[PDB]
């Protein structure tokens, strides 16, 4: 039979073998993979995130199966965009996890299949450390991809045939991938190296697409541009780099 613990065990193990029977099961009992019986009741977590949080060499073969089953229970978009709903991981989705676990293949698979690319990770865990969080990257898939130094993913997200992430997008703070980048900045060599490269990457991309929407001009909720934000918060490295490319 199939209940939450059995389903989670199977996916946690990456066993596609054991998923045999699931589709007929759900079909005959009128169940879906998004039904409450199949989520962690605290967080609302489905078995999709469960799968992603148990990779093995960044593989969990049950993922493409779970997706196909959701498709076939008429349920795929809802399934993929099912968000954590608890105060701590609120808003997080399968897409966020694919990005953070650094697996481009699942990002592509997820995006191609309809993943909301502007889903905001809003919960405590995603806010700044000083505000009781763990890692702040501006909440959005793109900003996450940028902040964790994954240019290939960043390019995938901004130019793909399915759904492009708008770079002008802002989080709850009105922060932008640029703002996010400075928040990420910590002045150390390798940090400044990538943060800088990335900043340039996005700035040039946003100029070449959308010829006339200057992204540095988008202010945050504190009405700070990314430049001033760096300034105000001691981000020497990134700040100098911004100025360098003036007149
Ligand atoms: N929401 C999350 N986002 C990112 N990482 C997580 C999250 N939840 C758990 N983790 C980490 O990733 C690992 C995988 O989580 P997974 O869902 O497989 O197990 P769990 O439900 O967290 O714990 P258990 O092993 O009791 O089920 C955990 O060991 C935890 O350290
Ligand atoms: O953390 C590894 C290294 O990274 C650099 O970006 C820092 O400036 C160094 O001080 C450090 O040894």
């Amino acid at each position: 039979m199939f209940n939450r613990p059995i389903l989670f065990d199977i996916v946690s193990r990456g066993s596609t073998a054991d998923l045999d029977g699931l589709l007929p099961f759900l079909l005959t009992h009128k169940k879906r993979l998004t039904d409450e019986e199949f989520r962690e009741p605290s967080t609302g977590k489905t078995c999709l995130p469960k799968a992603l949080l148990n990779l093995s060499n960044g593989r969990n073969d049950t993922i493409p199966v779970l997706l196909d089953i959701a498709e076939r229970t008429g349920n795929m978009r809802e399934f993929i965009n099912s968000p954590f709903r608890d105060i701590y991981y609120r808003g997080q989705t399968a897409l966020h996890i694919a990005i953070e676990r650094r697996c481009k293949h699942y990002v592509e698979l997820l995006v191609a299949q309809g993943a909301d690319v502007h889903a905001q990770a809003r919960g405590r865990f995603f806010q700044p450390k000083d505000e009781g969080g763990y890692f702040y990257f501006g909440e959005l898939p793109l900003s996450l991809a940028a902040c964790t130094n994954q240019p290939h993913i960043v390019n995938y997200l901004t130019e793909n045939p399915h759904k492009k992430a708008d770079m002008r997008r802002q989080d709850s703070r009105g922060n932008t991938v640029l703002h996010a980048l400075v928040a990420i900045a910590d002045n150390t060599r390798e940090n400044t190296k990538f943060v800088t490269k990335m900043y340039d990457l996005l700035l040039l991309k946003c100029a070449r697409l959308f010829p006339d929407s200057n992204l540095e001009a988008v202010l945050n909720n504190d009405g700070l541009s990314p430049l001033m934000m760096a300034a105000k918060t001691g981000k020497i490295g990134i700040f100098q780099h911004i100025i360098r490319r003036e007149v």
Side-chain angles (χ1 to χ4, degrees):
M1 208 221 42
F2 289 105
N3 55 25
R4 192 182 54 258
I6 283 156
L7 181 57
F8 280 30
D9 193 280
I10 288 169
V11 306
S12 90
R13 278 193 277 110
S15 164
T16 52
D18 296 8
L19 280 183
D20 192 44
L22 189 44
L23 170 53
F25 175 82
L26 294 168
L27 248 29
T28 79
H29 296 124
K30 337 285 192 319
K31 285 141 157 309
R32 292 180 211 253
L33 279 194
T34 53
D35 291 357
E36 292 293 308
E37 301 49 47
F38 298 112
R39 302 161 106 141
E40 160 183 74
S42 20
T43 65
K45 169 209 228 177
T46 69
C47 63
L48 180 44
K50 179 80 194 179
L52 284 154
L53 297 167
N54 300 267
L55 299 180
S56 155
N57 311 309
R59 296 164 73 31
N60 190 319
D61 296 334
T62 64
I63 293 161
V65 182
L66 290 182
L67 285 199
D68 166 70
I69 300 185
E71 162 80 313
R72 265 146 193 240
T73 41
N75 191 38
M76 207 195 219
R77 274 192 198 243
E78 187 176 10
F79 180 57
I80 285 167
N81 304 309
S82 277
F84 280 66
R85 66 201 181 188
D86 63 294
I87 87 147
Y88 185 82
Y89 295 115
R90 169 156 18 208
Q92 172 174 48
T93 74
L95 183 53
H96 296 102
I97 304 153
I99 296 163
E100 192 269 338
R101 295 288 209 248
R102 298 186 87 76
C103 304
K104 183 150 107 62
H105 43 103
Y106 293 133
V107 173
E108 292 176 30
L109 202 214
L110 283 184
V111 164
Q113 298 312 296
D116 171 5
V117 311
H118 297 307
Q120 318 175 217
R122 302 188 295 147
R124 195 113 312 295
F125 178 73
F126 292 115
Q127 264 20 68
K129 277 214 183 205
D130 51 282
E131 302 143 60
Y134 174 74
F135 177 59
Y136 170 80
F137 50 85
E139 317 190 310
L140 297 166
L142 186 50
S143 309
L144 175 63
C147 292
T148 53
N149 190 186
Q150 299 196 260
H152 299 287
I153 286 163
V154 161
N155 295 326
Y156 176 76
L157 286 169
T158 55
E159 41 216 358
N160 67 72
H162 315 294
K163 213 85 51 73
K164 345 284 267 286
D166 181 0
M167 12 197 184
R168 315 189 292 304
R169 198 69 162 245
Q170 314 171 245
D171 79 356
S172 320
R173 264 168 231 285
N175 270 352
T176 264
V177 67
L178 275 22
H179 294 95
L181 251 12
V182 352
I184 261 341
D186 77 349
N187 290 322
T188 67
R189 188 201 328 123
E190 267 55 57
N191 176 273
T192 317
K193 200 202 159 192
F194 89 76
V195 164
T196 260
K197 194 162 149 111
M198 195 65 82
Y199 193 102
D200 287 344
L201 175 53
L202 279 134
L203 229 172
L204 176 48
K205 202 188 291 297
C206 192
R208 210 262 328 298
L209 277 16
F210 315 106
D212 49 5
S213 34
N214 168 220
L215 224 193
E216 247 148 352
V218 189
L219 269 16
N220 72 2
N221 285 169
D222 307 331
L224 297 180
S225 92
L227 176 74
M228 292 319 167
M229 189 189 175
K232 201 262 156 79
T233 57
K235 302 304 171 72
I236 339 169
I238 170 74
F239 178 75
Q240 313 251 53
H241 169 97
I242 300 178
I243 320 282
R244 226 80 95 346
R245 0 153 332 161
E246 81 308 66
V247 83

PDB file of all heavy atoms in Angstrom, residues 186-192, ligand 2:
ATOM      1  N   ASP A 186      31.002  39.991   1.004  1.00  0.00           N
ATOM      2  CA  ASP A 186      31.606  40.014   2.319  1.00  0.00           C
ATOM      3  C   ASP A 186      33.048  40.411   2.242  1.00  0.00           C
ATOM      4  O   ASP A 186      33.809  40.146   3.164  1.00  0.00           O
ATOM      5  CB  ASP A 186      31.470  38.660   3.015  1.00  0.00           C
ATOM      6  CG  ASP A 186      32.460  37.591   2.491  1.00  0.00           C
ATOM      7  OD1 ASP A 186      33.130  37.787   1.454  1.00  0.00           O
ATOM      8  OD2 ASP A 186      32.570  36.524   3.129  1.00  0.00           O
ATOM      9  N   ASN A 187      33.443  40.993   1.117  1.00  0.00           N
ATOM     10  CA  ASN A 187      34.761  41.637   0.991  1.00  0.00           C
ATOM     11  C   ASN A 187      35.990  40.742   0.791  1.00  0.00           C
ATOM     12  O   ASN A 187      37.040  41.235   0.363  1.00  0.00           O
ATOM     13  CB  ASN A 187      35.010  42.648   2.130  1.00  0.00           C
ATOM     14  CG  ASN A 187      34.137  43.889   2.013  1.00  0.00           C
ATOM     15  OD1 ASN A 187      33.866  44.405   0.916  1.00  0.00           O
ATOM     16  ND2 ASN A 187      33.694  44.379   3.145  1.00  0.00           N
ATOM     17  N   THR A 188      35.854  39.441   1.069  1.00  0.00           N
ATOM     18  CA  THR A 188      36.934  38.481   0.822  1.00  0.00           C
ATOM     19  C   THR A 188      37.234  38.240  -0.707  1.00  0.00           C
ATOM     20  O   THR A 188      36.341  38.347  -1.587  1.00  0.00           O
ATOM     21  CB  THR A 188      36.645  37.173   1.567  1.00  0.00           C
ATOM     22  OG1 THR A 188      35.492  36.541   0.985  1.00  0.00           O
ATOM     23  CG2 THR A 188      36.379  37.454   3.004  1.00  0.00           C
ATOM     24  N   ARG A 189      38.495  37.916  -1.015  1.00  0.00           N
ATOM     25  CA  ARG A 189      38.950  37.779  -2.423  1.00  0.00           C
ATOM     26  C   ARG A 189      37.991  37.002  -3.328  1.00  0.00           C
ATOM     27  O   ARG A 189      37.366  37.579  -4.209  1.00  0.00           O
ATOM     28  CB  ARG A 189      40.354  37.175  -2.510  1.00  0.00           C
ATOM     29  CG  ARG A 189      40.947  37.184  -3.908  1.00  0.00           C
ATOM     30  CD  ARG A 189      42.050  36.157  -4.022  1.00  0.00           C
ATOM     31  NE  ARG A 189      42.742  35.989  -2.746  1.00  0.00           N
ATOM     32  CZ  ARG A 189      42.876  34.834  -2.085  1.00  0.00           C
ATOM     33  NH1 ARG A 189      42.393  33.689  -2.585  1.00  0.00           N
ATOM     34  NH2 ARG A 189      43.523  34.808  -0.923  1.00  0.00           N
ATOM     35  N   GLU A 190      37.885  35.696  -3.099  1.00  0.00           N
ATOM     36  CA  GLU A 190      37.048  34.848  -3.935  1.00  0.00           C
ATOM     37  C   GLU A 190      35.596  35.317  -3.990  1.00  0.00           C
ATOM     38  O   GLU A 190      34.944  35.176  -5.052  1.00  0.00           O
ATOM     39  CB  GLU A 190      37.145  33.393  -3.511  1.00  0.00           C
ATOM     40  CG  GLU A 190      38.197  32.608  -4.280  1.00  0.00           C
ATOM     41  CD  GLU A 190      39.584  33.239  -4.216  1.00  0.00           C
ATOM     42  OE1 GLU A 190      40.121  33.440  -3.114  1.00  0.00           O
ATOM     43  OE2 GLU A 190      40.146  33.562  -5.277  1.00  0.00           O
ATOM     44  N   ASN A 191      35.117  35.893  -2.870  1.00  0.00           N
ATOM     45  CA  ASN A 191      33.760  36.437  -2.794  1.00  0.00           C
ATOM     46  C   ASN A 191      33.597  37.578  -3.791  1.00  0.00           C
ATOM     47  O   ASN A 191      32.806  37.512  -4.745  1.00  0.00           O
ATOM     48  CB  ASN A 191      33.404  36.890  -1.368  1.00  0.00           C
ATOM     49  CG  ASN A 191      32.018  37.555  -1.285  1.00  0.00           C
ATOM     50  OD1 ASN A 191      31.878  38.766  -1.490  1.00  0.00           O
ATOM     51  ND2 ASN A 191      31.001  36.772  -0.976  1.00  0.00           N
ATOM     52  N   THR A 192      34.377  38.621  -3.568  1.00  0.00           N
ATOM     53  CA  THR A 192      34.404  39.763  -4.446  1.00  0.00           C
ATOM     54  C   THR A 192      34.635  39.371  -5.910  1.00  0.00           C
ATOM     55  O   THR A 192      34.085  40.006  -6.825  1.00  0.00           O
ATOM     56  CB  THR A 192      35.505  40.667  -3.956  1.00  0.00           C
ATOM     57  OG1 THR A 192      35.391  40.702  -2.526  1.00  0.00           O
ATOM     58  CG2 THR A 192      35.388  42.058  -4.579  1.00  0.00           C
TER      59      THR A 192
HETATM   60  O1  LIG B   2      38.060  31.503   2.470  1.00  0.00           O
HETATM   61  C1  LIG B   2      39.126  31.227   1.555  1.00  0.00           C
HETATM   62  C2  LIG B   2      39.905  32.462   1.083  1.00  0.00           C
HETATM   63  O2  LIG B   2      39.006  33.244   0.283  1.00  0.00           O
HETATM   64  C3  LIG B   2      39.292  34.626  -0.002  1.00  0.00           C
HETATM   65  O3  LIG B   2      38.147  35.083  -0.721  1.00  0.00           O
HETATM   66  C4  LIG B   2      39.710  35.438   1.288  1.00  0.00           C
HETATM   67  O4  LIG B   2      40.002  36.847   1.156  1.00  0.00           O
HETATM   68  C5  LIG B   2      40.885  34.720   2.012  1.00  0.00           C
HETATM   69  O5  LIG B   2      41.246  35.445   3.188  1.00  0.00           O
HETATM   70  C6  LIG B   2      40.597  33.201   2.266  1.00  0.00           C
HETATM   71  O6  LIG B   2      41.759  32.460   2.629  1.00  0.00           O
END
